[PDB]
Structures are given as C-alpha cells and as structure tokens.
Amino acid sequence: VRGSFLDKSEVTDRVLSVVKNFQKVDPSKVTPKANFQNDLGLDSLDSVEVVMALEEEFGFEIPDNEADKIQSIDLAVDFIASHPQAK
Amino acid sequence: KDWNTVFERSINTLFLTEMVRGLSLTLKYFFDPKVTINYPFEKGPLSPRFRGEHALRRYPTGEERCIACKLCEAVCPAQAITIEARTTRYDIDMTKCIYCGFCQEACPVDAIVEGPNFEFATETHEELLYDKEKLLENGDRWETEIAENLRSESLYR
Amino acid sequence: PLLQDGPPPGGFAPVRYARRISNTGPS
Amino acid sequence: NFTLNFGPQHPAAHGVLRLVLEMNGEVVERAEPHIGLLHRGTEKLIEYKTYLQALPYFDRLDYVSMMAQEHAYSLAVEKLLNCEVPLRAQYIRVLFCEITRILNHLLALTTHAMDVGALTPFLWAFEEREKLLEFYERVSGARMHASFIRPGGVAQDLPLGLCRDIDSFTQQFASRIDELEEMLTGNRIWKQRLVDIGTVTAQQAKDWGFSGVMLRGSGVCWDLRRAAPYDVYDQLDFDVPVGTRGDCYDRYCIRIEEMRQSLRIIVQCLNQMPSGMIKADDRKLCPPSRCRMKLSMESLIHHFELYTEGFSVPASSTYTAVEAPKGEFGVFLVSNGSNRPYRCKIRAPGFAHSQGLDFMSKHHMLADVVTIIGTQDIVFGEVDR
Amino acid sequence: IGVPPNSANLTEARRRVFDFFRAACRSIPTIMDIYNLQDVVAPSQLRYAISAQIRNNAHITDPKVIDLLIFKGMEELTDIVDHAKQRHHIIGQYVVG
Amino acid sequence: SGIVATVFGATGFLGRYLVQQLAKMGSQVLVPFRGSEDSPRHLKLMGDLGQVVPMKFDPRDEDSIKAVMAKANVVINLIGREYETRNFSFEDANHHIAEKLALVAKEHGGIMRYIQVSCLGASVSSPSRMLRAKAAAEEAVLNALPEATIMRPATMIGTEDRILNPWSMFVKKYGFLPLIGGGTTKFQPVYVVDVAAAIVAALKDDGSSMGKTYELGGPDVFTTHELAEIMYDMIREWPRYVKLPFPIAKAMAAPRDFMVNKVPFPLPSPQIFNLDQINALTTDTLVSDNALKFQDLDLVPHKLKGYPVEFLIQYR
Amino acid sequence: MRCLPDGNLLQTKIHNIGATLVGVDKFGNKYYQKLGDTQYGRHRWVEYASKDRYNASQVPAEWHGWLHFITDHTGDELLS
Amino acid sequence: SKAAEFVISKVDDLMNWARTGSIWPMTFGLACCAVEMMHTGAARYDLDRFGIIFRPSPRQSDCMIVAGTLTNKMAPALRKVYDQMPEPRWVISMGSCANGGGYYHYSYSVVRGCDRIVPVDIYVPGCPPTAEALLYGLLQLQKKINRRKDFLHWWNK
Amino acid sequence: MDNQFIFKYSWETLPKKWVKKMERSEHGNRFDTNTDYLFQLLCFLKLHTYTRVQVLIDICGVDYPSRKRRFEVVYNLLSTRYNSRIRVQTSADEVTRISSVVSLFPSAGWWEREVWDMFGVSFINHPDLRRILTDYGFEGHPLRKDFPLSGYVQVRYDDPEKRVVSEPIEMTQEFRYFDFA
Amino acid sequence: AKVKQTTGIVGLDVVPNARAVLIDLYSKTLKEIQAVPEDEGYRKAVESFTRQRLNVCKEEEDWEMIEKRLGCGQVEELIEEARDELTLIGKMIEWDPWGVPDDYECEVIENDAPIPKHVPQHRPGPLPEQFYKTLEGLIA
Ligand SMILES: NC(=O)C1=CN([C@@H]2O[C@H](COP(=O)(O)OP(=O)(O)OC[C@H]3O[C@@H](n4cnc5c(N)ncnc54)[C@H](OP(=O)(O)O)[C@@H]3O)[C@@H](O)[C@H]2O)C=CC1
Ligand SMILES: CCCCCCCCCCCC(=O)SCCNC(=O)CCNC(=O)[C@H](O)C(C)(C)COP(=O)(O)O
Ligand code: SF4
Ligand code: SF4
Ligand code: SF4
C-alpha cells in the first residue's frame, strides 16, 4: 500500500540528527522538546539556518508565515510529520 | 464609389501592375556599365590629405627632422607614441593609434606625418609595433610622394 | 591664399529635389 | 510563454543586438533588449582627455553620422567658451551636417530594406554613399572619422574644386532618390511589411523621450533646426515633414523626404557659401598657421600650449542639443575651469528609441521585430557609449 | 517588485535580511546543478558561506547600509544564477570546493 | 622569469597545459612544430605578446633542431607516440628523437635544465614495445645528460585525452564498452594539469630535481571497469560492459600492426584496439613506493571525479 | 595563358585594349590610361610585371600617387 | 619518391586553389569597422567577385572577420561562435579596436585585442581601415592559405 | 515662453519648500530641490498648464567627492508645447535612495538603471533596477572619481578551462597621466 | 462651424462637443481649486487662466473662434491641458505642500555670462497676452 505522510518516528530521528550535527549544538542538550533559542544557544539567524536545513532534509519548502512557529524540535516534528509534501 | 474605379483597382491588384515597374527598372541597370574597381590593378581615389601609415622624415642632408620635442606624444588621443631622448626611442603602437593625424598637426618641424600608404596588413601583432628605425624606413620609401603632398597642402595649413 | 573654393559667378545651375512623375503603362 | 533569445552576431541586424522575446505562437508578448555589448567607457575616458583629445570619441558614437556628433560637441564647447565662429565655417558645418544626414538616411533605409528582403537598393545607395565618403576624405583625409568640425570652426579649408564636385553630385541625387522610392514606395509587399507596424501616438512619443523621425512620424511638428536653430539654419529654406499615422511606413516616407530637404539645404549652402576665415580668430583657443608658428614667437608659444595642455574652459555646466540624423543628440558638459572636462554625459536618441521597443512591438508578429528595429535606426555605439 | 523604501529601523531591516538569506539558500540546488558541483562541495558549505557573509557584517547599525548590502547581495545572487560565469574553484567572489 | 624554454612535442595533449603554465610563470616558450602552421595556433593565445613563439623544425634533421634550440637555456621533450606509422616506428618516435635532442642539447652547451617526459610503465622487460623504447630513451638521455630530469606520468585524463574520449565515442556509436582484460588491470590515472604542474615545479626548484625520475600517479587507484563507471555516471548513460579476452582483443588489433609497415599509404590511428596498449594492459602499472611521487615536489594531485572529468558533459 | 585561371588578370587585359602606355617603373610594372568617362573619368591602372604573385604593395611611391589619383604627376615626372 | 612528391604538390595546389577561391567569412560586425566592411562587400569593391560570400551561420563559414571593439561582456559570445566554425578556419582582425583595443585600450570594459580570445591570422590596421585596406588584408589571407601543404604533412605523419 | 517668464512664474506659483536654489542663466534655467520633493516638483511641471514639461530628455549623475552628499542627479527636461528647456537637480549620497520618476516619464527607466550602474544611486519604486551597461557580475561603479580608469579585472581565453575567464588586471604599458596644470 | 476631420496628431481623437466639454472642465476646476488656500500663488494662477479660458469658451460658439482667440492649439489640446490641471489639483490637495516653513532659505542666482549667437537657442516668440496678464496679476 502507498501512504502520504512520513512516519512520526522517522521524522523525529531525522530532525534530531539535523539539529545535533548542525554547527554549535553539542549533542547533549538536543532533546525531543528542546527549544532553539532558550536551550540551544542559537540566535535568530542560526534558528533560521536550522529551519532552512529542515527544508533540504525533507525536500520541501516551509512557508515563511509558518516557520515563525517552529521554535523547538517538538513543533518541528509536529509540522513535518503531517505535511504531505514531506519526503 | 464608382464601377470604373473599382474595376480599375481590381485589375491593378489582380495583374500586379505595380510589380512590373520594379522589374523594368531592375532590368534597365542590367545593361548599364558597372562601377566595380578591378583591384589590385585599379584603385579608388584618394586625396593629398589622406591619413595613412605614419612615417618619420629627414632633411635632404640625411639628418632627422625630429628634435624630440614630445608634442606629438602629448597630443596623441590614444597614447600610442612613446619617446625617449635627438630621440633614442620613438615607438608608435599601430594597434592603439586611431589615425587621427593630430601628431602631424602638432609637429613643429614636419617630422612625423601620416603618409599615403594604406596597404600594410600583417600576420603578427608585433609587426604593428613600429619602432624608430621602421618609421624612418617608411619615410625613406615614401619621401617623394610625402613631399609632393606637403607642397600641395601647404596652401591650406 | 586669397582664392577659396566656392560657387562660380552667378552660382550653380538649379537642381531638382522633388519626385518626378512617370505615366508609364497601358492600364 | 516560450522565450526566443535572438542575438544576431553580424551587421545584418546591428551586430551586438541581443533580444529576449516572450512569444504566444508567432505573436510577440514582450521584447527585452540586452545592451552594453558595446559599452566601452567613453564617458569615463573623456574625463582623462583634454577638450581637443576628447573630440574623436564623438565620431565613434553614432558612427554612421560622424560629423553631426562632432558638431554637437564643438557647439557645447563654444557655448561654454563664448566663442564666435566665422560665417564661412558655419556654412561648411551645415553643409557637412546635411551630407551626413543623407549618408545616415541612405544606410538606414537600405539596411532596413535588405532586412525585409529587398537586396538591390542597398547596393544602389551605397554607391552614392561612396561619393559622399569621398567629400569627407577630400576635406579631412579620412572617409569616416574626419574629426573635421572643431570648437571654433573647422580644421581646414575646403580644397579647390570640392564645391563644384558637390554641385555635380546634387545635380543627379534626386534621380537616385526617385529610383529608391520606385523600388519601395508603391510596392504592395513593401506596404504590407510596413503599414500599421509599430504605431506610436504623440503622447507615447513624448512619454518615451522620442525625437527626430521617431517623434515627427506621430504628427508632432518638432525639429531642433527650427525650434532651437544653430549655425546658419535660420538663413536656409527647408520643410519639416510630419506623419499622420505614426507607423513604420510614415517614418520611411519621412526619411525619404528628409533626404530631399537635405539636398535642398546643400544646394543653398553651396550657393551662399561666403569667403573668409574658417577658424575663430581668438588667439588663445585656435592653432596658428604652420608658417606663422615657424616665423612668430607668439604663434609658436600658442601652438606649444594648444597641443600640450589644451585650452581651459571656465567653470560652468550646460546641456547642448542638435538635430542629429537619428534624433536629438545632446551633451551635458561640466567644466571645472581646467583643461579637461569634469563630466561629459552623452544623450543618445537610440537609447530612448530602443527602450521603446517593448511597447512598439507588443502584439506584433516575430518578423515585424526587425522592421521595428530598422525604423528606429539603432546604432549601438551611441546606445552603449 | 519595485525597489522598496529604506528600512525605517533595524527590525524591518533584519526582516529583509532574513528574507534575502532564505532566497539565497533556496537557490543553492540550482547553483549546484548549473556549476556541476556534486563532486566538488556540499550544499551546506554554500549555506555556511552565505551565513558567514551575513555574520561578518553583524556590527552594522545603520538600516540604510543594511538595505544597500541586501540590494547588492540580491544583484550578485541574480548574476550568479541567471548569468553564471563558470570558473573551477570559484563562484562569483567565493572560492568554492 | 628569465627562462627561455624550447618545448618539443607541445602540439599534443599535455603540451597546451604545459605551455599555459610556463607562460603563467613569465617564461618565454619556443614551440617547434613539424607540419602545418595551424598545429601550434591554439598556443599563440597563451602568454603575452611575443612570449610564445612557434617555429618550424624537422625531426630527422639536426640543423633545424639546433636552430630551434639556439636561443634557449631550458629544453623539455614531450615527443612520443603510442602507435606506429610506416614513417616512424616505436623506437624511431620514442627513442631516436629523444636521444638526438639530448645530444644536440649537449653540443648546445647552454641548457641549464633538461626535462624528458616518459611513461610510468617504461621498462626493459615490458610487454609494450613503446614502453621498452621509452625506457631505452630514458637511459639514452640520462647517459647523454646525467643532470637531466625524468617524468613518468600515468595515463593522463583531460579534455583531449586518448582513453575516456575514445570510450565515450565507442559507446555512443555502438552502445556497449569492451573490457580488454576483463576490466581488472589497475593503474593510477592522473589529471593532465597535475603533470604540467609537476614539470613546472621541477623546473622551479633550487636544483634538487636534477638527475632524478619522478613517478606521477593520480591520488587514487582504479580498475579499467571502475574508470568506465566514472565515465557512465558523467555521460548520464546506461552501462553495458562486454568481456573481451586478451587473445580476441589482440586478434582485432592485429591487422593495423600487421599492414602498417607494408601498405604504402597512411592508416587511421587506433582508438581502443591498439596492440601495444593492449599488451600493456596485461600488467598493473602503479607508482612504486621507492620512487619520488607528487610529494617531494610539494604537490598534491587532483582527484579525477568532478573537474578533471567535466569535459564528459559534452557527451550527454 | 594566365587569363584562363586568373580572371582578375583577364579583366585588365580586356580593358587594356585601346589604352595608352604612360610609363614603366623600375620593377617593370606598366601603367596605362584611357582618357574616357566610365568610372567618372577614372581610367588609370597598373599591369604588374609578375603575371602571378602580383601584390598591391609592389607599386613604388613615385607611381602610388598617380595610381590613386592623388596627383596628376606620373612616376617619371616625380622622379625628375 | 621522385613521383609521389609531384602528385602530392599538385594535390596541395588544388586544395589551396579551392580554399582561396571560395572564402566564406562570417562577419562579427561590432562597431564602425563593420560599415567599411559593408562598403567592401558593396558594388565598388564587390567581394563577391573574388568568391567571397558572407554567411549567417558559423557552420557554413571558413573565416571570421572581427570588425570593431570587443567588450568583456561580448567576449564569450565571440569565442563560442568561433568554436562552432568547422576546420579549416581563419580569423581576420580588422581595425585598431580589434587589433589591440585602440582608442578604448585603457577602458575597464574592453578586451585589449581580440587575439586574447581567438587566434588571429591577419591584422588589418586603421581606424577604420579603408574598404580597400580590408581587401588587401583578404589577399594577404589568400597568400597565407597558399603556403599550406596539408596533404604533404599528413602523408609524412 | 522665455527663460525670464519661467523663472518669474515658477517663483510665483511653486510651493516655496520645493525649491532651495533657482539659477537664471544663458547656460540654462536651473532648479535645485531636496530629494523628498523631486517627484512632486516634476509632476507639477509636467501637468501644470503654464509649464507642460512633457519630455524627460535625460537623467545623469555627477560625482563630487569633496561633498558630504557626493552625487548630484540632474534632470534635463523639455516642453515641446512652449519650446523651452528646464534643468532640475538634487543631491544624493552612497546609501540614500531617491524617488524614481518612471511613473511620470516611462523614458526614465533605463536612465535610472544607468545612474545606478555608473554611480550606485538607488531609486525607490523603480520596477526593474539592475545594471544595464556593465558586464554581468561587475563590481564597483565606474563613473565614480575613485574608480580607476582601467578598472580592476580583465578577461582572456583560458585553454585549460576551455572558456573566457576574468583575472586581476596586468598592464603591459600603464596609462600615462600627463599633468599640464 | 464645419466639423474637424483630423487633429493631425496621432492618438488625439477629434472632440466634436469640445465647447461643452471645456466649459464643464473649467467649471469643475474653478470649484475644486477652492480647497487650496486663497493666499497660494498656484490657486491665483489657476483661477486667472481658467477664468479667462472659460469666458472665451462661453462667448464663442464656434470652436474655430475659441482656438483663434486663445492662441493655444486645437480645442483637443486645450481639453488635455484642462484634464491635466484637474489631475494636478487633486494630487496638490493630497500633498498639502502649502505654507512657508519657519527657517526657509532660498538662494537665487541670475548668472549673466553671454553665449554666442550661433549655438542652439530656443526662441519661441511671445505668448498670448493672457500669460502676461496672469504673471503680472501674480506679482501684484
Ligand atoms: N596517456 C598519455 O597521454 C601518456 C603519455 N605519455 C607520454 O608523454 C608525452 C606527451 O603525451 P601527450 O601530450 O599525450 O602526447 P601526444 O601524442 O598527444 O603528443 C605527442 C607530441 O609529439 C609529437 N610527435 C609525435 N611523433 C613525432 C615525430 N615522429 N616527430 C616529431 N614530433 C612527433 C606530436 O606532434 P604532432 O602533433 O605534429 O603529431 C605531438 O606534439 C609523450 O611522450 C607520451 O608518450 C606518458 C604517459 C601516458
Ligand atoms: C553563492 C552565494 C550567492 C549570494 C551571495 C550573497 C552575499 C551577500 C553578502 C552581504 C550580506 C550581508 O551582510 S546582509 C547585511 C547583514 N547585516 C546585518 O544584519 C546587521 C545587523 N545585525 C544583525 O541583525 C545581527 O547581528 C545578526 C547576527 C545578523 C542576526 O541577528 P541575531 O543576532 O538576533 O541572530
Ligand atoms: S594618428 Fe593620432 S592616435 Fe595615431 S599616433 Fe598620430 S596622433 Fe596618435
Ligand atoms: S612633434 Fe615632431 S619633432 Fe616633436 S617629438 Fe614628435 S615627431 Fe619629433
Ligand atoms: S578601430 Fe576605429 S573605426 Fe574600427 S570600431 Fe574601433 S573606433 Fe570604430
């Protein structure tokens, strides 16, 4: 059978790895609920960087008026885990 | 508007009447003599003012006319003249030069001129970097025509 | 010198500049 | 919409012409010229030249109408210097300007005609062009880039016998114009290629800065020779042809008529040509005679100064325009008191005309684009500078 | 489409910066294809170079200077994408690979 | 630089890259050519006005040789040929000319640096007659000039190479690519630009390169099958390898070698089925561990994938 | 016999018919004129000494002006 | 080989005769020099009469005339057109701009000579060269083509 | 409509805060205005019955390095209705955007592109503001006085890359500056 | 009284009811200009020439007489100018450029360097008398 949404666990692992290997994120604060700005020492430019990295890894563009709400890993995974364009 | 004018317009359109005149006067030129010049046996007309290949001139004694005043180097719009100094170096980059004749106007002793030669195409760029000895050879080769042209043109300049 | 290139005494002959008609064709 | 990228890398259509067209089938939706392929930094170069050394740059802008740009630059320099030109020089300037206009119109008309497939008029017209190039060479020693018209007048006087040969040319030129016309004017194919092509309203022509034939084709009676006369144009009889439809056919007819009027002006200049000096007599701005410089100290000093430093122009700025064959050609000259122009902005009519190609060619066929380019009379030396 | 007015303050200028950075990053795959870089450099290195260029100017406090820098960056991106001049280890002004 | 270099054999593959690099360093380059004046035409754009000077010479004539060499203090020889013509044998093209050039350089007296370019597999006990002649030429040049420097590049890769281009042509014309030895021979192919850079570096040193032979191999070791795959990734085509055993390949490469020295007219050059190169494919040609590599010239060779094979874009 | 392959030389031989010999230079080039009016009375041309390998640069300076209508003086009068 | 050389020289003479008698230039009409080039092809000089026919496509061309200033923006277009020309091919540089940058030599936007982009066979000096000067340059090209010995060089290779 | 009438009538009718300087001279009538009033002044001159300045002849920049606002932008305009010319000028610096007049004069489009290319002055609301004369990827603004005459880079064919490429300039014979002052 | 067949200007259509159109436009203008302060010179200039033109149009019934007395082009061009003046009156209410600022400075220069007769010079000729009446009324 053919589906339309990526699995939640797969998206969680993918986003976790992307944040872990980014540039300035020690893979010890990276939890499935960790916030970019308050808990990862990332400025707004770096958070935009990470969100743009989320786009390449899942192969689709996230709307600008929607990226403003993806501030942690949980909100991210909530977004990509239900978006049909995700691959 | 009227049956006659409509009929005449129709006939002219159908019979291509206006296309005939173009055919006719194209055919008239067919039998007339041609204006082509049989180069290189025949040449186009030129004037004593023609601005061709530069040349350096000497007095009849054999002494060079140039006294290294550097006026031609100063006026040259293309900066194609390089002089060290009588000159010990006098270079004209024939590929920078715009063949304007300013240098000949500036020269106070009629030393540098643009002579009448226009047939000096080369196979290399370096042959178009004229040095002093080449310019003096040009002057020796074209001296009689250059002098005749100068005699002709001295009544205007 | 005192001789300059110019028109001859009386000027040059008149020249036409306008189109000439041509009524050629049996029509 | 598909995109056809058209660059003719040959003088069939300009040579550096580069067009991006959006098409709906064979219908043109948008024409976008890409220019700068002949941008040579002329305006920057001029700032490093004396006013005399800058003069040859103007021969190379609209390099089909050499002496007209020479004339415009000389006029701007004369205006800033308050320099008085002798009458004989004025007449020679106008005579050569109208010869140039004929040279330009012949080239423009017949290259357009060859573009739309009429081959013979090009050869016929270029023989007459060769005769006019001979007058350029007889006065300057150059067929094209004469650098003959200068601040203060002209470089040299006419050689003996030139006026007679020009008169001989004028006696036969009308028949040549008539032959070109009979080849083109009444031919149904020529009319089908040009009638209602590239229509321009008077409001559009004003909005897009059109000038010359591009403006007069739309019914606007405007010619700088009459609106802002210079040299001896106010002593001369000529008509200003204007169009009624504003299309390519009207502009073709206007160019033919302009050649006829130029012939008229040349005849008048030949008959009214006076004797006297061809250079302004102010001994601080004009070269002395060769014999004077070899005989008189003051003359030698002035010659040395003129050919090394050049003359100075008092600090000021002005815009000067002439009716060039392609339209209004203008120079915005800024002087700082020194011997070199501080700024020289060149206003080329082809720049305005080519900018208008988008609105002119809208909703026309692909084959009409070359027709519209030809009616604009674009030379990229002046467009790009 | 048209050239916008100058940013009134640093907040709106920062917003324009973020928009330019997004537009530059989203054009990376096109650049990789055009210059054939698959076996020469990773896309993230391009992203990193763009962000480093943005960071080296992080001390600017005048919104007009920021607007001009953004305009120049847009022009350079457009020339890189639309009118690519392929060299080998060099894209525009950056040593790649 | 005040170096005046006479580069023999500069109208071939490696010559253009070498002349470009020599002109970059400011050297004056003399380019002897044997045939049409259009053969060195592509070299004239390199360098400034007067810096690159092509000159007609004849190989089988000593006067012309010293004539083109009369103005130089550096001589680089690139002359060689991997096949045979009725006029020039393997030993004639790869040994006699090189020895003659070395002798003329000795009688010249002014040649500070002499560089002779050889092949990596050049040895006396080589299956390839061209490699045997190459080793003989190496010995002859060294005996005539003990201070000369020897380069031994591997199969070179580039826009005008004679390995990837023939493979692409054959594939696009037939649909399949043969493998002469089952696609198992190993070799370290090398970017041609790196070979040119190594020659320039040996010309630039403080004198340490004289008397020594350098083995210039690419960074990586491949099988002929492994290279055929870079060609297919790059030419965006579906691969289809066919095993041609050695005796069969030698059979299909036998006619030209047989009738080249018999028929009195020229033959087309071999692309894939050259007998000598097939013989060379029998053994593996690798850079020896005891030799001098791109290191000891302070150079790192470029990897093949990407830029060295970018010319393969033209075949898609 | 050079007329058959060289049509350029043939045109000169044809137009030499009825022409007047004006002079010969030091290289043996021959100079002819007609005194008519076809190309606006321009009827001066040179027959080069070498019927093959002729080249325009072989016209000496004394005759170059006459050939290009720069002057009405022939090469002989200039040399005297 | 007392008989092979004669036949080879005859073959080469035939090849050179064919290639000199049918030269099909493509014109790169960039600036003012293109106008003098147009005059060369016109009735007075009639390049047609020498067998010279101007072609629109580099694919049918044997020669490229670079007539005018070459800018940095245009250089890639010139090189690509040259690369589409089938062998044998020749390049004529016409005028000071194409030869060495001319009046624009010191500009920030101009290529200082087209021989930086393509190999040049003949340089025609002048600004612009007269139409007759271009014709002389084309006759020099014929002279260069007539030294070719393609068949002999290939026989010996 | 002579230059005395234009000067007097414009003094009487224009809003005072639009014009900082008014010159009457045979070299041309000249109005200087702040950048924020340029658009409105040009619209007034175009639309008003007694001026009818319908043709924008050109726009050009002039560089004055000794000035805090180094650039001066000059608008040359023509009234075919009254056979008169007017010059309107405003000053600008390297970072301050000025208003485009394309919506008033469509001919301004390319002249503004040229000012941006040559001098680096930007134009608000210009629909398509990119370089128009220089080579793609050009850096700098050549008509600035501090930009060197020969520029910074040149191009040549590179056989190993099989393409035309750009390198830093190298001059065989440098431009000689002759100082006659 | 004869209807005009062409204006001779491409894109400028004939307006056969040009008198009524002109009267309506001028009346609209004289109404809408009252939103400008009475002290502003723009308002006085517009009222002056608009009232003169309106009076001419009201008096003359034949458009040829209107064109002749005005000295200002065809009635179609007079309509273009009236519409443009109305448009300008709207933009000027919206811009509110009126009044004089507190620290208002303005440099006048009357440069009198002469220029030669032969250089291009615009010499249109005298305007219709109403232009000078408008100007002198503005000065007074
Ligand atoms: N894969 C490779 O390319 C490898 C090559 N080499 C060797 O390196 C050198 C350069 O290689 P490459 O550039 O590819 O070689 P090419 O075959 O491409 O070029 C050979 C050069 O030598 C000239 N030449 C050949 N035979 C003669 C002859 N009889 N007389 C005079 N000149 C002659 C050619 O002249 P012309 O053009 O006139 O025929 C040409 O200039 C050669 O020695 C080659 O064998 C080393 C290892 C591998
Ligand atoms: C192949 C590439 C093609 C495109 C290349 C384009 C190159 C463009 C080069 C110029 C780009 C710029 O500098 S664009 C101008 C950038 N300058 C500024 O933004 C100054 C203000 N500073 C800040 O906003 C913060 O310091 C900041 C850290 C930035 C974010 O804020 P945070 O701290 O809250 O994260
Ligand atoms: S002709 Fe003009 S550009 Fe050439 S060297 Fe003489 S003065 Fe200089
Ligand atoms: S102007 Fe005449 S005399 Fe002076 S340097 Fe030049 S050539 Fe010699
Ligand atoms: S060489 Fe002279 S005529 Fe030819 S394009 Fe350049 S400037 Fe124009």
PDB file of C-alpha atoms and ligand atoms in Angstrom, chain B residues 51-52 54 71-81 90-94 96-106 112-114, chain D residues 56 60, chain H residues 96 103 127, ligand 3:
ATOM      1  CA  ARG B  51      45.729  59.841 -43.238  1.00  0.00           C
ATOM      2  CA  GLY B  52      47.579  56.556 -43.674  1.00  0.00           C
ATOM      3  CA  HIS B  54      52.845  57.202 -40.140  1.00  0.00           C
ATOM      4  CA  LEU B  71      54.478  67.419 -28.648  1.00  0.00           C
ATOM      5  CA  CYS B  72      53.117  64.504 -30.696  1.00  0.00           C
ATOM      6  CA  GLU B  73      53.352  62.238 -27.648  1.00  0.00           C
ATOM      7  CA  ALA B  74      51.459  64.802 -25.553  1.00  0.00           C
ATOM      8  CA  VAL B  75      48.600  65.407 -28.001  1.00  0.00           C
ATOM      9  CA  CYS B  76      48.063  61.769 -29.054  1.00  0.00           C
ATOM     10  CA  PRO B  77      44.457  60.909 -28.023  1.00  0.00           C
ATOM     11  CA  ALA B  78      45.283  57.186 -27.903  1.00  0.00           C
ATOM     12  CA  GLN B  79      48.650  57.429 -26.077  1.00  0.00           C
ATOM     13  CA  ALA B  80      50.155  55.381 -28.901  1.00  0.00           C
ATOM     14  CA  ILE B  81      53.504  57.273 -29.064  1.00  0.00           C
ATOM     15  CA  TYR B  90      60.341  56.607 -30.987  1.00  0.00           C
ATOM     16  CA  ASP B  91      57.589  53.970 -30.896  1.00  0.00           C
ATOM     17  CA  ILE B  92      54.067  54.107 -32.312  1.00  0.00           C
ATOM     18  CA  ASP B  93      51.690  51.290 -31.387  1.00  0.00           C
ATOM     19  CA  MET B  94      49.788  50.945 -34.673  1.00  0.00           C
ATOM     20  CA  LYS B  96      46.402  51.819 -30.292  1.00  0.00           C
ATOM     21  CA  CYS B  97      46.536  54.583 -32.909  1.00  0.00           C
ATOM     22  CA  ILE B  98      43.241  55.988 -34.193  1.00  0.00           C
ATOM     23  CA  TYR B  99      44.815  57.517 -37.340  1.00  0.00           C
ATOM     24  CA  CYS B 100      43.529  60.990 -36.437  1.00  0.00           C
ATOM     25  CA  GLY B 101      46.511  62.965 -37.724  1.00  0.00           C
ATOM     26  CA  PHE B 102      46.834  65.086 -34.503  1.00  0.00           C
ATOM     27  CA  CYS B 103      50.511  64.145 -34.230  1.00  0.00           C
ATOM     28  CA  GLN B 104      51.206  65.516 -37.715  1.00  0.00           C
ATOM     29  CA  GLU B 105      49.348  68.737 -36.818  1.00  0.00           C
ATOM     30  CA  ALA B 106      51.289  69.113 -33.584  1.00  0.00           C
ATOM     31  CA  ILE B 112      56.109  62.838 -38.176  1.00  0.00           C
ATOM     32  CA  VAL B 113      53.478  62.512 -40.911  1.00  0.00           C
ATOM     33  CA  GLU B 114      50.719  60.129 -41.882  1.00  0.00           C
TER      34      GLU B 114
ATOM     35  CA  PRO D  56      37.463  61.903 -31.813  1.00  0.00           C
ATOM     36  CA  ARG D  60      32.661  56.852 -32.767  1.00  0.00           C
TER      37      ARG D  60
ATOM     38  CA  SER H  96      42.659  49.194 -34.081  1.00  0.00           C
ATOM     39  CA  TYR H 103      41.139  54.308 -28.544  1.00  0.00           C
ATOM     40  CA  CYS H 127      40.535  53.280 -37.534  1.00  0.00           C
TER      41      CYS H 127
HETATM   42  S1  SF4 K   3      47.427  59.312 -35.811  1.00  0.00           S
HETATM   43 FE1  SF4 K   3      46.536  60.232 -33.907  1.00  0.00          FE
HETATM   44  S2  SF4 K   3      46.363  58.472 -32.466  1.00  0.00           S
HETATM   45 FE2  SF4 K   3      47.773  57.797 -34.137  1.00  0.00          FE
HETATM   46  S3  SF4 K   3      49.865  58.282 -33.354  1.00  0.00           S
HETATM   47 FE3  SF4 K   3      49.214  60.047 -34.627  1.00  0.00          FE
HETATM   48  S4  SF4 K   3      48.250  61.475 -33.067  1.00  0.00           S
HETATM   49 FE4  SF4 K   3      48.383  59.441 -32.040  1.00  0.00          FE
END
